[PDB]
């Protein structure tokens, strides 16, 4: 929820004339997990919190057979994914990103013990780049920013990456991925 609630605000405040697409130009948000467990809690909690305000999520997961979310693929705002699933999704194009402006990668140490690191850089290889923040200290200006936040549609991408420990792997990962990013520690 503490990644989830900023983007469910940031969707409900847009106005009615920026929402309206006759086409799907793909999600508002990914959410990458790096387990089908992990996924499918971020799953339950985003339905739990997406269905009062008519907000559809999609899985893209393993485990579950092709057909349910092929299905659900066509249906067409939060897109919660599997690295290897999602990498089959978007090397044979059953889902763009175009409008994605919301990247999260929850637990990417798991990411990075496992091995999914080319294929996560791949995945950011599909992302287009005209929405990437600049590499100075304006991205991390809570003026411009906050006022950038306030245009709406037309706003930079912002990624959320959450880990417990710091290889140097996370550290090539931020580097890649982020502009200044705030380090929240808890404990």
Known sequence: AAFLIPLLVWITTLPKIDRIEESD???????????????????????????PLGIRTVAVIGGISREDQGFRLRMGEIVIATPGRLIDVLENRYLVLSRCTYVVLDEADRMIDMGFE????????????????????????????????????????????????????VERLARSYLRRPAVVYIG
């Open 25 to 51: 130009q793909g999600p508002y948000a990914i959410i990458l997990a790096p387990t089908r467990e992990l996924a499918q809690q971020i799953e339950e909690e985003t339905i739990k919190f997406g269905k």
């Open 118 to 169: 080319p294929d996560v850089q791949k995945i950011l290889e599909h992302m287009p780049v005209s929405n990437q923040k600049p590499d100075t200290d304006e991205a991390e200006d809570p003026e411009k920013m906050l006022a950038n936040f306030e245009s709406g549609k037309h706003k930079y991408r912002q990624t959320v990456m959450f880990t417990a420990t710091m290889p140097p792997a």
